[PDB]
């Protein structure tokens, strides 16, 4: 297939001014200084930029690009987004599971995967892990081959590669470009940008496009560029690389001179004639949920910090709290101990839930690439990642804390009281985690979200009801208490512990209190905190946490729905 | 001056195997793959590596390197350590203030600075800022020139540069090496490493040294290397860069074969002959503290986040606390409010002091370079940085919090009570900050220190005396309370507030309490927390904070004293 671009202009302010050319089966290179057109032309040709700025026309075999083009062509990112804790077989299987039709038997998909994994020369690493911070594995050259194979699953007629060797050593980079030249002889059209290639690479190209400051400096067959610039009036010595000599001419050893010469040059008139001659979801929501969740689960298991470390810290902190508060009493210190331990337990669920900021932020480049490439809906992605990562890692620490502390402290020895604590600790973890996803979703860095989360919890924790008595606050601040996640958790836990407790030994204060100030039963403590003694006074806190979950998970979804992909 | 090296070997496991060569007035380049000897030879030649491994001999004009050599020669780092918020004039003035003799008048130092700043062609930027995150300034080419000028202050006979063109665009990299060739014609010996030079750079070299896997592979005049490798049996085509062709030969288009050829080659025998024709503080502590403190203060004023932002956050949080706790009462809620507000104030001084981790960590590369270069003692550096950065940024927020909250809350209306709160809030800030410097000093990353600091404060804050009554804890944990910084602050504040308060309106309770359990005066509250009612019960907490300051600032100093510089 031949890809032809006519009178391309693009504006954000122009960045591509007017560009004309054709690209053909073979190996086609786009070169120039980094701030020039080189990357933006690749992303216009690939339909990776926003159509609002594009002012020219792009055709395939003389017919317009379909809106479907992003699904029928391959595009390989500069820095590889491949799963470092899956194996090479599993990464190709996830691509095949979602880019191939639902018609095909698993053997008919493995025939596609086997043709691909053999053609790329990955046979010795097919079952090796792709390498992670905690896992030594497959090398950077094989990591680049793996990323190319995820696009070859669909037999794309056109491959786009962003900067494919700008990150690899020269003795790897030649093997990657020799692999690409063998692929081009299969009839695939390969279009790519590069940074300062060696002479050893430049000899391989079937076409060259050269761009500076959004002006075209050359387009034609690649080996003619040296003769063109020596004819235009420059000089190359012996022992010097043409690909550096071109960028040297652009840098003045002015771009208006170089643009005007090309408009007058033979290679333009031949290109202009050719362009006037040429101008004559795949899959259900359920299957996407299933495979997104599956990949996300293998990733959770392939990492110590996201799983084992948080479980170990939970068990250790549970036993430390269990030792300090061992054997709670019914005396003058018993209220202070029960108030303080339940306040530690809820605020610890909030600050340990700040790690949820990292859920979408680390995946952002992979999500945007896979979403533009049509792997899945935003709905099945967002649900498949909640269901796989967030759900189990917030059940477990809530169950563990309750089983360890409860019978060490000697909290109320009733079955429903134990399960109401366990359910209340779990609701405050999902609520705090949902607020983290609402702050974090669509952002590119962990640090600003982590700060904003931390600042929110210290203000919410003032309005918790331990540090200030909420019945005393002035009416014009008092409504701020309804916005606090720690308060609904702490109120539900205090209701559940204190009802029917006594704290004045030798004094039956149940029917009367003989001196007014003594505070001898847990009902007197609860009403003095402004808590409601009815069963609705317990459950009102859980409906509030369920609402904060639903609102924040909607804000997190709408943030991914209206994020800018291009 | 000529620098010569004979039979150099180095081990950590060998990394330099056996190396011989001479370097002379002119421009001398060290080349090869990144994991090879190239950087380690430069740091052996420069005396920037630990002498424990060095097994050969290095010799200047036929005499040994003196221990003084690090002070008499220039060394320029790969990534520039220059002060991005000082100006070019000020950066050169700080180098001149410490590397030149104390004998010289300020005009005799400005004559040195003016000769240097003119010779580097910096005249249009002498009074421009060197560029920071919040401050647009001098470009990367003139930023590299500024770093070279900080070494030229001493008129060094030898300059070493690690990777001087790496990280600069090709026109800037030429301008830097054209500047260096003009400097070499002044009779200075310039020795440097490069990552793969363009042909148009390689033509400039007066000598070439080529290294791979800790073997020497060429040493001679630079233009002879192509003829040597074409004689040894390789082939260079037209249109190809020799400097890439050498690294291609080293990559096998084996290193033992190429090392054996060099041992037999004419250029070895000629080098070996000459190596047998050969071989047959500046300033007081006070001045260093004065100038270190001065640089550090200009840097604090040149940044928004390190100063203005923490003051604004302090004033806002002070007024928010002042509104929530407005007008404290002498009723059943008055103990809870006074306990909770004083606990917020001390724990906020701990967590806001976690930012002290960043003090030495961000300066680490600059400190090690300047210390090896003999700018200052570790004593005058460490004191000059405490005195300048840490001291004012821990007084101010403590004074501001006290002036805002005290009369909004209506804490005890006595002059000494107000100053004892202000002094107690200030001691807990210096103590928490000193613990941060003890954890952080000598580490290279903020994140691990920040986590360890945060984990320490949540365990210290359990033992604070609000959340658990310290009189109830089992004897085998109870001694852990003495290790906690928040507890000494909170105990001193509670002592100062609660003495002589009453909390049961309409009851007098100074001589008796009509019913026990009632808790009607601040002495009953203090003794029920296990606090001592004597004046030593107040002051014991401040001697404890002063001891934690002295211990942690010693651990921070001994960490910089026994850090590995090489």
């Amino acid at each position, epitope marked *: 297939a031949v890809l032809s671009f006519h009178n391309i202009c693009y504006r954000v302010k122009e960045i591509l001014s007017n560009i004309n050319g054709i690209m053909k089966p073979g190996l086609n290179a786009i070169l120039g200084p980094t701030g020039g057109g080189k990357s933006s032309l690749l992303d216009v040709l690939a339909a990776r930029k926003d159509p609002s700025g594009l002012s020219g026309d792009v055709l395939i075999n003389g017919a317009p690009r379909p809106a479907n083009f992003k699904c029928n062509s391959g595009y390989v990112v500069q820095d590889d987004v491949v799963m470092g804790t899956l194996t090479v077989r599993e990464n190709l299987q996830f691509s095949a599971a979602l880019r191939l039709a639902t018609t095909m038997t698993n053997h008919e998909k493995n025939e596609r995967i086997n043709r691909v994994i053999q053609e790329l020369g990955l046979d010795k690493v097919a079952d090796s892990k792709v390498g992670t911070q905690f896992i030594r594995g497959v090398s950077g050259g094989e990591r680049k081959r793996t990323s190319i194979g995820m696009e070859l699953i669909t037999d794309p007629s056109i491959l786009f590669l962003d900067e494919p060797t700008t990150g690899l050593d020269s003795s790897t980079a030649n093997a990657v470009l020799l692999l690409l030249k063998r692929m081009s002889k299969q009839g695939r059209t390969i279009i790519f940008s590069i940074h300062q290639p060696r002479y050893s690479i430049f000899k391989l190209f079937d076409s060259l496009t050269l761009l500076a400051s959004g002006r075209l400096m050359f387009h034609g067959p690649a080996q003619e560029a040296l003769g063109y610039f020596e004819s235009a009036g420059y000089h190359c010595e012996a022992y010097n690389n043409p690909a550096d000599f071109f960028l040297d001419i652009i840098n003045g050893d002015l771009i208006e001179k170089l643009a005007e010469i090309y408009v007058n040059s033979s290679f333009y008139k031949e290109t202009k004639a050719e362009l006037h001659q040429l101008s004559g979801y795949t899959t259900s929501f359920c299957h996407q949920l299933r495979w997104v969740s599956k990949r996300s689960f293998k990733n959770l298991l392939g990492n110590p910090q996201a799983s084992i470390a948080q479980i170990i810290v939970t068990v250790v902190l549970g036993l430390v709290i269990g030792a300090i508060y061992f054997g709670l009493k019914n005396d003058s210190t018993g209220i202070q101990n029960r108030a303080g331990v339940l306040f530690f337990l809820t605020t610890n669920q909030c600050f340990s839930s700040v790690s949820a900021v990292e859920l979408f932020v680390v995946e952002k480049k992979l999500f945007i690439h896979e979403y533009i490439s049509g792997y899945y809906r935003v709905s099945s992605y967002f649900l498949g990642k909640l269901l796989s990562d967030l759900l189990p890692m917030r059940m477990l620490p809530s169950i563990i804390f309750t089983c360890i502390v409860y019978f060490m402290l000697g909290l109320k020895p009733k079955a429903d009281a134990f399960f109401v604590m366990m359910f209340t600790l779990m609701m405050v973890a999902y609520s705090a985690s949902s607020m983290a996803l609402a702050i974090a979703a669509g952002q590119s860095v962990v640090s600003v979200a982590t700060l904003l989360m931390t600042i929110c919890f210290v203000f919410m924790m003032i309005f918790s009801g331990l540090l200030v008595n909420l019945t005393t606050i002035a009416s014009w601040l008092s409504w701020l208490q309804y916005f606090s996640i720690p308060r609904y958790g702490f109120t539900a836990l205090q209701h559940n512990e204190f009802l029917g407790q006594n704290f004045c030994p030798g004094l039956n204060a149940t029917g009367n*209190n*003989p001196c*007014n100030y003594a505070t001898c039963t847990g009902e007197e403590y609860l009403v003095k905190q402004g808590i409601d003694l009815s069963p609705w006074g317990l459950w009102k806190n859980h409906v509030a946490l369920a609402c904060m979950i639903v609102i924040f998970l909607t804000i997190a979804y709408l943030k991914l729905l209206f994020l800018k992909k291009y | 001056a000529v620098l010569s090296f004979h039979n150099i070997c180095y081990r950590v496991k060998e990394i330099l195997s056996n190396i011989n060569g001479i370097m002379k007035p002119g421009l001398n380049a060290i080349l090869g793959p990144t994991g090879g000897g190239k950087s380690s030879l430069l740091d052996v030649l420069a005396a920037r590596k630990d002498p424990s491994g060095l097994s050969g001999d290095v010799l200047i004009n036929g005499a040994p390197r003196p221990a003084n050599f690090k002070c008499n020669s220039g060394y320029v780092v790969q990534d520039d350590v220059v002060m991005g918020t000082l100006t070019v004039r000020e950066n050169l003035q700080f180098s001149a203030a410490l590397r030149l003799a104390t004998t010289m008048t300020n005009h005799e130092k400005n004559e040195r600075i003016n000769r240097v700043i003119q010779e580097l062609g910096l005249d249009k930027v002498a009074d421009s800022k060197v560029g920071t995150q919040f401050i647009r300034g001098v470009s990367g080419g003139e930023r590299k020139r500024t770093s070279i000028g900080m070494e030229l202050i001493t008129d060094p006979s030898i300059l070493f540069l690690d990777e001087p063109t790496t990280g600069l665009d090709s026109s800037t990299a030429n301008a830097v090496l054209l500047l260096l060739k003009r400097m070499s014609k002044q009779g200075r010996t310039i020795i440097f490493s490069i990552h793969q030079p363009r042909y148009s750079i390689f033509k400039l070299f007066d000598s070439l040294t080529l290294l791979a896997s800790g073997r020497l592979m060429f040493h001679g005049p630079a233009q002879e290397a192509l003829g040597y490798f074409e004689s040894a049996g390789y082939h260079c085509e037209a249109y190809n860069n020799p400097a890439d062709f050498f690294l291609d030969i080293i990559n096998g288009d084996l290193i033992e074969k190429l090392a054996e050829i060099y041992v037999n080659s004419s250029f070895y025998k000629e080098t070996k002959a000459e190596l047998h024709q050969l071989s047959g503080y500046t300033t007081s502590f006070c001045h260093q503290l004065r100038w270190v403190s001065k640089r550090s203060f200009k840097n604090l004023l040149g940044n928004p986040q390190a100063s203005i932002a923490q003051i604004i956050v302090t004033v806002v949080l002070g007024l928010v606390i002042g509104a929530i706790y407005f007008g404290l009462k002498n009723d059943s809620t008055g103990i809870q409010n006074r306990a909770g507000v004083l606990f917020f104030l001390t724990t906020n001084q701990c967590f806001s002091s976690v930012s002290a981790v960043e003090l030495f960590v961000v300066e680490k590369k600059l400190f090690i370079h300047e210390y090896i270069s003999g700018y200052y003692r570790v004593s005058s550096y460490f004191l000059g940085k405490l005195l300048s950065d840490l001291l004012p940024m821990r007084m101010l927020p403590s004074i501001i919090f006290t002036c805002i909250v005290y009369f909004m809350l209506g804490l005890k209306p006595k002059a000494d009570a107000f100053f004892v709160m202000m002094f107690t809030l200030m001691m807990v800030a210096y103590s928490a900050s000193s613990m941060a410097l003890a954890i952080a000093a000598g580490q290279s990353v903020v994140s691990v220190a920040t986590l360890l600091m945060t984990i320490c404060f949540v365990f210290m804050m359990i033992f604070s005396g609000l959340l658990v009554n310290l009189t109830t804890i089992a004897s085998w944990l109870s001694w852990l309370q003495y290790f906690s910084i928040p507890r000494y602050g909170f105990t001193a504040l509670q002592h100062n507030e609660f003495l002589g308060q009453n909390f049961c309106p309409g009851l007098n309770a100074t001589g008796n309490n009509p*019913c026990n359990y009632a808790t009607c005066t601040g002495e009953e509250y203090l003794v029920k927390q296990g606090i001592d009612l004597s004046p030593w019960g107040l002051w014991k907490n401040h001697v404890a904070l002063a001891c934690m300051i002295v211990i942690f600032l010693t651990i921070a100093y001994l960490k910089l004293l026994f850090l590995k510089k090489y």
Partner: antibody, heavy 118, light 107 residues
């Protein structure tokens, strides 16, 4: 123990009302809190405020900025002073003692009427 | 604040009969409830102090039997000395509040 109100029984709109209470048989700086309570024409009771044995004081929010209570420990007196008085709050004014540990108004004066009119 | 309701403004009862006066709080009061008897031309006199305890100098014919938010004052075998106005008062929250008062009148 023993309480007695006194003061002007008749006052102008926008003027200030002022009642003394004198205590005997006990000392106002010893133990209790000391109250003012008013009873309206068409009987309902409003509690107005107190001064405590230590001289601290507290008021009903219905009287915001209008009321203060003060004392003379030389002679066991305390005083109701109520500014910007209005014909809507003619009442019978009582001083009373709040016992603290028991929580109740155990001792009352006989109370004094106040008339406010144009 | 907390408001007290006494449901009837006035009764009508014979000598020697039984009578029962109801006081409803808006918030929980945890027995911090007192009852006052007022004869015409006199200060209110305390009768019950804490919802179930009776003052020395009143007959055991009176007793109070409340809990939670609902409180009540009982007289069994009332007598001619008992005729008057009765108020409940809460003393839980710092703005102390009386009920609207209820009157006993002979029949």
């Amino acid at each position: 123990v023993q309480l007695q109100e006194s003061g002007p029984g008749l006052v102008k709109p926008s003027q200030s009302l002022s009642l003394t209470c004198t205590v005997t048989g006990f000392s106002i700086t010893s133990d209790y809190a000391w109250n003012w309570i008013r009873q309206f024409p068409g009987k309902k009771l409003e509690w107005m405020g107190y001064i405590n044995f230590d001289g601290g004081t507290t008021y009903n929010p219905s009287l915001r900025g209008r009321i203060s209570i003060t004392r003379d420990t030389s002679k066991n007196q305390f005083f109701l002073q109520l500014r910007s008085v209005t014909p809507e709050d003619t009442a019978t004014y009582y001083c009373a003692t709040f016992y603290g540990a028991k929580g109740t108004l155990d001792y009352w004066g006989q109370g004094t009427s106040v008339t406010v009119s144009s | 604040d907390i408001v007290l309701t006494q449901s009837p403004s006035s009764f009508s009862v014979s000598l020697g009969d039984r009578v029962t006066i109801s006081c409803k709080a808006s918030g929980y009061i945890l027995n911090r409830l007192a009852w006052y008897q007022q004869k015409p031309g006199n200060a209110p006199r305390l009768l019950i102090s804490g919802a179930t305890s009776l003052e020395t100098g009143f007959p055991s014919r009176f007793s109070g039997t409340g809990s939670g938010k609902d409180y009540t004052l009982s007289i069994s075998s009332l007598q001619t000395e008992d005729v008057g106005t009765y108020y409940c008062q809460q003393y839980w929250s710092t703005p102390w509040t009386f009920g609207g008062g209820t009157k006993l009148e002979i029949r």
